[PDB]
Amino acid sequence: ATLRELRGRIRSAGSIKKITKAQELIATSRIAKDRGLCGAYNASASRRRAMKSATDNADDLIKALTLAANRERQAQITQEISEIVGGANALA
C-alpha cells in the first residue's frame, strides 16, 4: 500500500501545482488590472508571490514523492523476485 499511497500523493500534488500555477498567473494579470492565499500579507502581488512559492513547493514535493515512489517500485520488484526465487530454490 506504500506505492499506492505515494502515487495518490503524487496525483494530489500535481493537481495542487496546476492550481497554484494558474492562480499565480491570474494574480500576475490582476496586478496590472477576503481570500487567504496571499501569504503573510494579512499577518494581488502578495498572492502572486505566495502562489509562486506554493507552486514551487508543490513541484519540490512532486519530485521527492516521485523519488520515493521509484524506490518503492524497485524495492517491490526486488522483493517479489526474492520470494519467487526463494520458493524455487526451496523446491530445487
Binding site: 500500500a1 520470494e83 526451496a90 523446491l91
Partner: protein
C-alpha cells in the same frame, strides 16, 4: 516400545529415523525429559520440532513414541496459574490437578453445533461496547502499531469480568485465558500483577511462551490456551481468550517451517499460515443449547508496522475475525484514548451483542462518527458552513470527547448507557467540548449518589423504560443548573 534415533539436529529441529508407527503430530520423547512433535513424515525420517531445550539433543540419541497426538491437561485447577504451552506450571506454585486431557487439534464446532452470538461481553470501554460491541462466542481482533493500547484493552476487558465472577452464576461468569506469545518475561509478570490487583487471577489463566522460549512453544501457546478454554466452553461455561499476540506466533511458525525446509510463500511465511490462524480462531464459538450453551470469545492481537494493515498476517487475521478494533498512534497522541479508528473498526455481530438500552442509545453512533470525521476533513478550510454542517461538527466533537476513557477505568453497562444517552440524545450540546468529559463524570456520579434507580432499571431490565428516560432527562436538566462550565 517403538524407538527411533536422532540422525541430525539443530536450531530446535531434529530428524529421527525409525518410529515406523509414529503419527502425524505425535508427541515424541527425547532423552532428558525433552519433548518434540512429528511434523514431517517421509520414508527416510521424521522431522520433529523440539518443544523445550534442544541444546541437549544429540545425534544418536534414542527417541520414543508417546502414542499421543499433541494434548494438554485441562481443568479448573488452571485458574490463577501461569503455565507453559504444555500446561506445566511456571509460576513456582506446584502441580496443577488436571481434570482431564484435551488434544490440541480437536475440531471446531460445526455449523449445526452453534447458535447465534446474542450475549454481550462487556469490556467496560465505552467506545467498544457502544460502537464495536463484542458478544459471547465472537472473535474481535485488536490490531494496531506498537504502544497503541492493545494489551490495555484486552486486560481491561479481563478485569471488567470481576463482577460477573463474583455473582457466582456460571451463565454470567467469564473465565479468562491470557496467552502471552513472544513477550518479555517481565512484561508477562506486569500483566499478571495488573490482573492480581484487580482480582482477575481468581478466574484467569495465563499460558506463557516468552521470547526466550523455543519457536515450538511460541507456535503452540495459542492452541494450548484454546484447548484449556475449550474444556470449559464445552462444559457450559463462558470463556474469554486473549492472544497477545498472533503476529509472533506466525513468526515462530515461519521459523519452524523454514528450519524444516518447507517451501516459503509470501514474506517467507509457509503456505498454511492463514490455516494456522483460521483453525485456531474458529474454535472460538457460541455453542448451541444442545451442547450446553457455552462459549469462547476470542480477542486476538495483531501488531502492525508503520500502520500497514496490508501486510500478510494482518490481512489474514482481519479476514478471519468477527470485526476489529483498529488502534492508531496518531489518534492516541491526539488524546483519543482508546485510540480506536471509528471509520474502519467494526463488529460483525452488531446490535445482537448489546443489551436493548445500549442498542437504542448507540444505534447509529458508529456511522455518525464516520460521517463526522469525513465532514471534519472536508470542512477543514470552509468559511461560513451550513447550519446543519456546523451542528454536525459540534455534535461529533462532543461524541468524540464522550468516547474518551482512561486506562483501568471501566464503566458498568448502565453507566455506559447513560453516558452515551447524554451525547446521542443531544444533552451535551449545551456543554463546551472541553468540559464534556468532566460533565459526564459528574453526571454519572450524581445519578450514582441519587436517582440510582435509573441504573438499577437499566441493569435489571436491560432496557431504558420510557419513564426512566423521562426521569433521566429531568435529572440531567436539573444537574446542568449546578454544573460549572469552566
Amino acid at each position: 516400545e517403538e524407538i527411533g534415533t536422532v540422525i541430525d539436529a539443530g536450531d530446535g529441529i531434529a530428524h529421527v529415523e525409525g518410529l515406523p508407527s509414529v503419527m502425524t503430530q505425535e508427541l515424541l520423547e527425547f532423552p532428558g525429559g525433552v519433548l518434540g512433535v512429528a511434523l514431517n513424515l517421509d520414508e527416510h525420517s521424521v522431522g520433529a520440532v523440539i518443544l523445550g531445550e534442544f541444546e541437549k539433543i544429540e545425534e544418536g540419541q534414542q527417541v520414543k513414541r508417546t502414542g499421543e497426538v499433541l494434548s494438554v491437561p485441562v481443568g479448573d485447577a488452571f485458574l490463577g496459574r501461569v503455565v507453559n504451552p504444555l500446561g506445566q506450571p511456571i509460576d513456582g506454585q506446584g502441580d496443577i490437578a488436571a481434570e482431564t486431557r484435551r488434544a490440541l487439534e480437536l475440531q471446531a464446532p460445526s455449523v449445526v453445533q452453534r447458535q447465534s452470538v446474542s450475549e454481550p461481553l462487556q469490556t467496560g470501554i465505552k467506545a467498544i461496547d457502544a460502537m464495536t460491541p463484542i458478544g459471547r462466542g465472537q472473535r474481535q481482533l485488536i490490531i494496531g502499531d506498537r504502544k497503541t493500547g492493545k494489551t490495555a484493552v484486552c486486560v481491561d476487558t479481563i478485569l471488567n469480568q470481576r463482577e460477573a465472577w463474583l455473582t457466582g452464576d456460571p451463565k454470567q461468569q467469564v473465565r479468562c485465558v491470557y496467552v502471552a506469545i513472544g513477550q518479555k518475561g517481565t512484561t508477562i509478570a506486569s500483566v499478571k500483577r495488573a490482573l492480581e490487583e484487580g482480582g482477575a487471577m481468581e478466574y484467569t489463566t495465563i499460558v506463557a511462551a516468552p521470547a526466550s522460549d523455543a519457536a515450538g512453544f511460541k507456535w503452540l501457546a495459542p492452541y494450548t490456551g484454546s484447548a484449556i478454554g475449550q474444556h470449559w466452553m464445552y462444559n457450559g461455561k463462558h470463556v474469554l481468550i486473549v492472544f497477545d499476540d498472533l503476529s509472533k506466533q506466525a513468526d515462530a511458525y515461519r521459523a519452524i517451517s523454514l528450519l524444516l525446509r518447507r517451501p516459503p510463500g509470501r514474506e517467507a511465511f509457509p503456505g498454511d499460515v492463514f490455516y494456522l490462524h483460521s483453525r485456531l480462531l474458529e474454535r472460538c464459538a457460541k455453542l448451541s443449547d444442545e451442547l450446553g450453551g457455552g462459549s469462547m470469545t476470542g480477542l486476538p492481537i495483531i501488531e502492525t508496522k508503520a500502520n500497514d494493515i496490508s501486510a500478510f498476517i494482518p490481512t489474514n487475521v482481519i479476514s478471519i475475525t468477527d470485526g476489529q478494533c483498529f488502534l492508531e498512534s496518531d489518534l492516541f497522541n491526539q488524546g483519543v484514548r482508546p485510540a480506536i479508528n471509528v471509520g474502519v473498526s467494526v463488529s460483525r455481530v452488531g446490535g445482537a451483542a448489546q443489551i436493548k438500552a445500549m442498542k437504542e442509545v448507540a444505534g447509529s453512533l458508529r456511522l455518525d462518527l464516520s460521517q463526522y470525521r469525513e465532514l471534519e476533513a472536508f470542512a477543514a478550510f470552509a468559511s461560513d458552513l451550513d447550519a446543519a454542517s456546523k451542528a454536525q461538527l459540534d455534535r461529533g466533537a462532543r461524541l468524540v470527547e464522550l468516547l474518551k476513557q482512561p486506562q483501568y477505568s471501566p464503566l458498568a453497562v448502565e453507566e455506559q448507557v447513560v453516558a452515551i444517552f447524554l451525547g446521542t440524545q443531544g444533552h451535551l450540546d449545551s456543554v463546551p467540548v472541553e468540559d464534556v468529559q468532566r460533565f459526564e463524570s459528574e453526571l454519572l456520579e450524581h445519578v450514582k449518589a441519587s436517582h440510582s434507580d435509573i441504573f438499577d432499571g437499566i441493569r435489571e431490565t436491560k432496557k431504558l423504560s420510557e419513564e426512566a428516560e423521562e426521569k433521566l432527562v429531568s435529572v440531567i436538566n436539573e444537574f446542568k443548573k449546578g454544573f460549572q462550565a469552566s
